[PDB]
Design a protein around this ligand. Structure first.
Ligand SMILES: Oc1ccnc2ccccc12
Length: 115
């Protein structure tokens, strides 16, 4: 509360570390469904069903332009990519399995890096 501060976790390397994690996700062989925005003009249903589209290139642009106020807002967008994927794809489909794999990949990097 006012004039009562909790000890400050060092966040000086957060930007660099999130960038490294994102690079690792960008270069994963199962990242191909998530590299660019889904084409809303070519994929029936996507625009109406998925209220907040998100993809790696969009996360990269936001990270590079100071649009994440902290590391948790970055993690929220990454998870949104995989949440959208689960909403729109069957678990037993190529894209569906890719999403599950990528989420697992991300969360271990996240824990190992920050927890
Ligand atoms: O859910 C998806 C993620 C990435 N690409 C997609 C392409 C077509 C239909 C769904 C997709």
């Amino acid at each position: 509360s006012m004039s009562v501060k909790k000890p400050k976790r060092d966040d000086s390397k957060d930007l660099a570390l999130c960038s490294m994690i994102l690079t690792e996700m960008e270069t994963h062989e199962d990242a191909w469904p998530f590299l660019l925005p889904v084409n809303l003009k070519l994929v029936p249903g996507y625009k109406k069903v998925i209220k907040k589209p998100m993809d790696f290139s969009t996360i990269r642009e936001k990270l590079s332009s100071g649009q994440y106020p902290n590391l948790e807002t970055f993690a929220l967008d990454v998870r949104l990519v995989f949440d959208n994927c689960e909403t729109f794809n069957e678990d037993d489909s190529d894209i569906g399995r890719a999403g599950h794999n990528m989420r697992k990949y991300f969360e271990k990097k996240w824990t190992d890096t920050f927890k």
